Amino acid sequence: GRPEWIWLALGTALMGLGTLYFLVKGMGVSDPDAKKFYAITTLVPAIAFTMYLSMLLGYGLTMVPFGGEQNPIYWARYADWLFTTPLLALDLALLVDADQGTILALVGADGIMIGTGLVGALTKVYSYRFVWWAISTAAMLYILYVLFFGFTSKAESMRPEVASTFKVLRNVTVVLWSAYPVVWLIGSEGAGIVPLNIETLLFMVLDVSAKVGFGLILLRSRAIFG
Ligand SMILES: *C/C=C(C)/C=C/C=C(C)/C=C/C1=C(C)CCCC1(C)C
Incomplete structure (x- = not known):
């Protein structure tokens, strides 16, 4: 009966719906390249759906x-993110033909x-919590710098339609991740200013936007076509 449960139930639902929808469209497509994007992108909210469900329970x-x-710390989020954030990067990496070393570095x-x-x-130790937070956010910035400067340059060599789709996803990613x-x-893991209920709502909106939102934009595009 924790108050944040309603948001865990909505994120469960949204992620579940999103998974099914992508699976349905994915198995209908026969293009090899498009099936790869679909397989990667259907897995993401799939993983998120199982984790949200676990937390809900x-x-x-x-x-x-x-x-x-x-x-109270929800560690199940990190088990979700550990595998869904690199999959999202892979999606972006494949779009622009990124170098294998680039992808290894990103995932790393x-x-x-x-x-x-x-x-x-x-x-x-309270103070040390922010020390770990700082490094993590430093790693995050490195990734965004690469996707903004590095990947946009690679995108330049792709057709306009592919480059256009990437810019939208690149912007969606940059805006959501930095949040x-x-x-x-300011939430439960840090300053404890925003309460866990509200914090769960914020992460749900970001999560769903970053997975199903991101997916809908990518999977409905001509850019995933070989
Ligand atoms: C589907 C989930 C996505 C796209 C999650 C993205 C998550 C981040 C960009 C998380 C970043 C964090 C930091 C920069 C530092 C502190 C701890 C985290 C893990 C919340």
């Missing part, structure tokens, strides 16, 4: 003590961001 939540209090950075974020989430560290900062 009481899993992935633990009490961490810091600030002289017992604080991404592993670090999610890994330090979680360590930071679980840290019992996660601030939410963590």
Whole structure:
């Protein structure tokens, strides 16, 4: 009966619907290249759907003590993000033909961001929580710098239609991702200013927008076509 459950139920529903819709459209398409984008992009909200469900049912939540209090931390989010954020990057990476080393570096950075974020989430010394938060956000910025400067340049060599689709997704990604560290900062994991219920709502709106929103834009485009 935690108050944030209503948002966990809506994120479950939205992610589940989104998965089904993408699966249905995906299995209908025969183009090889398009099927690859569909397979990657249907997996993302799939993973998110299972995690939101678990949390809705009481899993992935633990009490961490810091600030002289017992604080409720949803660690199931990091298990979701660990695998969905690199898959989203792969989507963007395939669109622009990015180099294999570039992708290895991104995913690597991404592993670090999610890994330090979680360590930071679980840290019992208040001050140190933000030390882990800082590194994680530093890793995040590296990724955004690459997608904005690096990937946009590679996109330049693709047809206009492919480059156009990437810019939209690149913008969607940049705007949504940069909002996660601030939410963590002022929410349950950080300053404890925004309450967990509201925080769950914020992450749900970002999550769904970043997965199903991102998906709808990518999968409805001509750009995934070989
Ligand atoms: C579907 C989920 C997506 C697209 C999640 C993106 C998540 C981020 C960009 C998260 C970033 C974080 C930081 C920069 C620092 C503190 C902890 C995190 C993990 C909340």
